[PDB]
Symmetry: C3
Subunit: 385 residues, 3 copies
C-alpha cells in the first residue's frame, strides 16, 4: 500500500560537489515518491562546466531552469554522423544540440548524454526520472552508468569505491577492446579523477560550442518565449508538453506542464485522472491544499522555490500564489496528463444537471445555478478571493 | 506468490446503508481477489434513488442485474453540452444516458458518474473494479472520490470522519474557487449529510427522467434481448462483450460474458488463456470444479445466486447447473478473454492426432477416436450426464 | 530491490527423469533470475520420445540445440483442420510442424504444445520462460498444465500427488463432458502413468512423422544454415530473431540472439538498453566480465557449455572465447533487444566529439583520437589481444 496521507513539500536531502558545479538529490524513499516511483535531481553547472556522459535505467525529462548550453545525445540505431570542419583535420561526431532556459529536454532510458554550460550564469537543470516506467525492467531504483570520471553515485547511492563503467573491467580486455595500452586504460578507468561528475573544460574544448525515430525532436521549450494553451491575462498561464506537441513523449510515457501564477492568482480545484503530478517550484511560493478520497487534507501548507510536491493521481488540488507570485514545472508520469476541473466554464459541476446538483448538495435550483455558473474563468483564476 | 489453492464462493462481507438503498462490498483481501486485484461491489438503489457522483482510481464495469434508470458520465475532453428545453430557462448539461436490465455499463478510471433509479423495482448493480489495471498508478487498493454527500468509504474503508472531496478544503479556497459564500461552502462540504451515498431525490428532480473517443458507446446489453454468439437450444447460452463489440473496452482492458444454463446443463471443461474470470451468479446455483497446474482441485462445490467465484487465468473449469438452472455475469481482466475448450467440436482434444492421444492416454486408436469425437456439442453442453 | 551484485554462471539445480528422456530446471529463485523473472528448462528427449502436451502461464522461446522432430501447437481461435490421408479412415488434426537444430521455436502463453523426436540423436531443447511477461496475470511463478500423464511438476515444483488437469475433476463430470465411461476416465486421469512427462511412443505412432494471427510463423532458424546480420570473417557471428524477422515476437515480447565466437575471439564491451539478456552456452567456454553502475565487477569468470549467465539490462559486458571457441543462445526479455557498443565503428565513443573525450578522460586530442578511432571492427572482435 502507498502511504499518501501526509504529503510534504520536499527539499533535496543529499548533495555531491563537483569540480565545476554540484548535484542535489531528493529523497527517493519519501512516501509519495516511492508510490509513484519518481526521483528528482538538480544539477548546477558553473560556466565552462561539463556534466560527464552517462546513461540510466529510467527515462528522464530535464527542465532547464536557468542558463543555456549544448548537449549530445546518441540514441541507438541513430548513428548520426557529423564532420566538424577545418580551420586540415575533420572530426566525426554526434549532432551538437543547443538548449536554453525554458527547454524541456528528453532523455530516453539507456541513452547516454552529456551537457555543457556555454553561458555566463550557472546552468540549473531539474531532472525528473521515473523508475516505474515500462522502459525500466530492473527495479524501482535509479542507476546511472557513467562513461568517464569517478562519480560518487548519489542518484540512489547505496540506499564504496564507485567509478565509471570501465573501472570495473580488467586492463587486458580494455586494451584489446579499444586497441590501446595500459597507459590509456588507466586514463579510461579514471582511478584518480577527483572531479566527480561535473568537470571544468580545459583551454581548448570549444570548437564544439559554435553548434523515423531518428528524426523526432528531443526537446520543446515551454518557457515564456512560447505560447501557452491555457492563458489568463490577469491570472497566469500553463504551457503543456505532451506527445501531441512532442511525439517522442509517446515513447518515454512522460509529459510536463510549466505554470505561471500572478500574485494572489489561484489554480482552480482539479485532479489528474491519469497520472501523478510532480511539481517543482521554480519561483515564488504558494499555499497548496490536497484532498484524498476520504475527503481528508493530505497536505495543507506552503511550497517555495526549490521545493517539490508530489500530487498523486486523482487527488484533488488547489493552488494559490502568494504576493511574489508562484511559478513551476510539473512532471507527469504519463505521455498525456488529463486534468478535470471541479468548477469553471468546462467542469464537472457544469456537466451536472441542476436537478442532480440540488439533491446532491441539499440546495435549491437557484443556489445550484449560482453554484455551477458562478465561476466563469477556467483552469487559472484571476485574483478574486 | 498468489495463494490459489483454496478458492471460495464468496458473499459480500461489508455493508453500508443509505437513505435510498445500500451498498455491499466483497472482501478485497480474499486470496483470489488479491492475486487478480479485483473488487466487487453491489448497489441496491430503491425507486427515486440517486447514487451520488464520484470517480475512482480503477476502471469499472457495471452489470445491471435488475431495474432501469439513467446515468451521467462526463469523460474528460468530451465537454458534451446539452440544453434542457423549456416548459423560459434552459439548463446546460451532460447527455442523459438511460440503461436497463442486461446492460453492461463502462466507467473508465478517473471518470465521475452518477446513477438514478427511475423504475418501480429496486435497481441492482454489480460493480466490477480492477485495481491491477494499467490505468491505476497508485496501489492495488480501490479509492472512490465523491463530489457530494458524506459516504463512509467502504470500497476499501481503512483496510475516520470521511467525507466528499470538498470537505477537505478550507472555506476560503472554495469561496474563491466557486465564487460563493460560506453558506454555500458548508452545503458543498456536506458536514451534515447523513444520507451516505444513495439519496432520495426530492419532489422536483424529474425533468431529466424523460431522457473520436467522445463518440464511443459506453454500454452494451448482453441480456436476453440480444443475440448470444454461443447458443445451445437445449443447453443455454453465453453473450460476450469485448472490444470487438464495444470499442471502449480496448481502453479499459476489461470484458464480460453473461451466461445462462438450463436445468442440469453443463459448461464444457475449459480455461481462459489470457485473463482471470470473476463470476457473479445472478440466479440459480451450480456445482463447479476448478483444477490447477498440479492437477489438484482448488474448488469443488456450489455457487449460488449472489455469490462470486474468481477463476484464475489458465485454471481448468467445469460448471453444471442445478435444477433451477444457473445464470451469471463473468468479468474478465482483459479486453478480449479467450477460452480454450478441452472437449467438443473445436477443442484441444480435436486438434491432437490420434497417434498422439494414444501414446498420451495409454489407449488404442479406437478409444482415442471415441475420446476426441465423442462430444459433438460446443462450449455449452445440453443435459446429458 | 534486485540483488545484482554477484551474478553466477548457473547450472541446472533440479532434474526429473522420464521414460524417454529427462528434464533439467535452473534455480528460479536465483537472484538475477528472480529480478528478471526468468526460468530456464532443458529437455533431453531420446529417439521416439514424446514430450506430452501442456500449456503454461508464461510465454516461451525454445532453442533446438540438437536433433530434430515435429511439434503440434494449437493457438486459440486458429482451429487449423487437417486430414491425414488414407493408406479408408482419415483423421482430422492440427498442422504437423517439423523443426531442426538451430530453430528458435515460439510458444505463446496459454497455448498447449507437444514435441516428438524423430531423429537418431537425443533431442536437446533450451526452454526460456519469462514470468514477468504482460501475458502472465498470476504471479512470477511458472506453472505448466499438462493434458496427459502424471508429471512431477518441477518447473517450480512447490517452491504432492501432482497430476494432469483431468485428474483433479470428478469422474462423472468427465464422463458427461467427453461422453465416455469410467473406464476411459481413469485412462484420462492417468492415475497410474509412471512415465512422467516424456514418453516412449508405441509401435504404431508414426503416420504423423512424415509431416491473420493464424498465418504468423512460429519459428525461425538462427543456426548455421542461415545468414547472420553481424558477421566477422575472422571473429565469429551473431544471428538475431526479433519481431522484425519473426512478427509473432511482437506478441510474446521476447527475442533471441545466437552467437558464435572463434577461438580467442572477443565480443566488444556493450550493454543492452532495453532488456535483460539470458545467455545459455551451447558449446565451448569463455571468460566474461560484467560491470554495474557503480563501476563494480558483478561477475568475472568463466561460462561453460551448459551454463546460464543472466546479464541485467544496462549492465556493461565483455566476452572472450577460449581456445575451444565459445557458442551460445541469448534470450531477450523484449521483442527487440538493442545493444549499444562502447568501442568500434559505430559506438558511443565514436559519437563523442574529441573535445568531449579529452576533458572526459584527462587526455589530449591525439590520445582521444587513438581512443575513439583505434578499434575498427564492430560487435565481434577478431583475435587481437
Ligand atoms: Cl496546476
Ligand atoms: Cl463459462
Ligand atoms: Cl553478445
Amino acid at each position: 500500500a502507498c502511504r499518501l496521507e501526509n504529503l510534504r513539500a520536499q527539499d533535496p536531502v543529499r548533495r555531491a560537489e563537483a569540480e565545476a558545479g554540484f548535484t542535489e538529490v531528493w529523497d527517493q524513499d519519501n512516501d509519495e515518491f516511492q508510490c509513484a516511483g519518481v526521483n528528482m535531481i538538480r544539477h548546477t553547472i558553473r560556466p565552462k562546466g561539463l556534466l560527464l556522459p552517462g546513461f540510466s535505467n529510467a527515462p528522464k525529462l530535464i527542465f532547464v531552469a536557468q542558463g543555456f548550453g549544448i548537449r549530445g545525445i546518441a540514441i541507438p540505431g541513430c548513428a548520426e554522423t557529423y564532420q566538424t570542419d577545418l580551420r586540415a583535420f575533420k572530426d566525426q561526431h554526434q549532432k551538437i544540440r543547443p538548449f536554453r532556459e525554458g527547454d524541456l529536454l528528453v532523455v530516453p532510458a539507456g541513452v547516454s548524454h552529456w551537457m555543457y554550460n556555454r553561458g555566463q550564469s550557472d546552468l540549473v537543470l531539474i531532472v525528473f526520472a521515473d523508475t516505474r516506467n515500462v522502459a525500466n525492467q530492473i527495479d524501482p531504483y535509479l542507476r546511472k552508468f557513467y562513461l568517464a570520471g569517478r562519480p560518487e553515485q548519489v542518484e540512489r547511492g547505496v540506499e564504496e569505491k564507485s567509478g565509471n563503467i570501465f573501472s570495473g573491467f580488467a586492463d587486458e580486455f580494455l586494451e584489446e577492446a579499444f586497441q590501446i595500452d595500459g597507459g590509456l586504460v588507466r586514463k579510461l578507468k579514471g582511478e584518480d579523477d577527483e572531479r566527480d561528475r561535473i568537470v571544468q573544460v580545459d583551454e581548448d574544448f570549444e570548437v564544439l560550442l559554435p553548434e523515423t525515430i531518428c528524426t523526432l525532436r528531443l526537446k520543446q521549450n515551454i518557457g515564456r518565449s512560447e505560447r501557452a494553451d491555457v492563458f489568463n491575462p490577469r491570472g497566469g498561464r500553463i504551457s503543456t508538453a505532451n506527445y501531441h506537441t512532442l511525439p517522442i513523449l509517446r515513447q518515454v510515457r512522460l509529459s510536463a506542464e510549466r505554470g505561471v501564477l500572478y500574485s494572489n492568482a489561484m489554480v482552480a480545484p482539479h485532479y489528474t485522472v491519469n497520472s501523478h503530478s510532480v511539481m517543482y517550484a521554480t519561483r515564488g511560493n504558494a499555499r497548496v491544499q490536497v484532498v484524498d478520497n476520504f475527503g481528508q487534507s493530505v497536505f495543507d501548507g506552503e511550497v517555495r522555490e526549490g521545493q517539490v510536491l508530489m500530487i498523486p493521481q486523482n487527488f484533488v488540488v488547489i493552488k494559490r500564489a502568494s504576493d511574489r507570485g508562484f511559478e513551476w514545472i510539473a512532471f507527469k508520469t504519463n505521455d498525456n496528463a488529463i486534468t478535470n476541473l471541479l468548477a469553471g466554464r468546462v467542469s464537472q459541476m457544469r456537466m451536472l444537471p441542476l436537478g442532480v446538483l440540488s439533491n446532491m448538495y441539499r440546495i435549491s435550483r437557484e443556489e445550484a445555478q449560482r453554484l455551477k455558473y458562478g465561476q466563469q474563468e477556467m483552469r487559472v483564476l484571476s485574483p478574486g478571493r
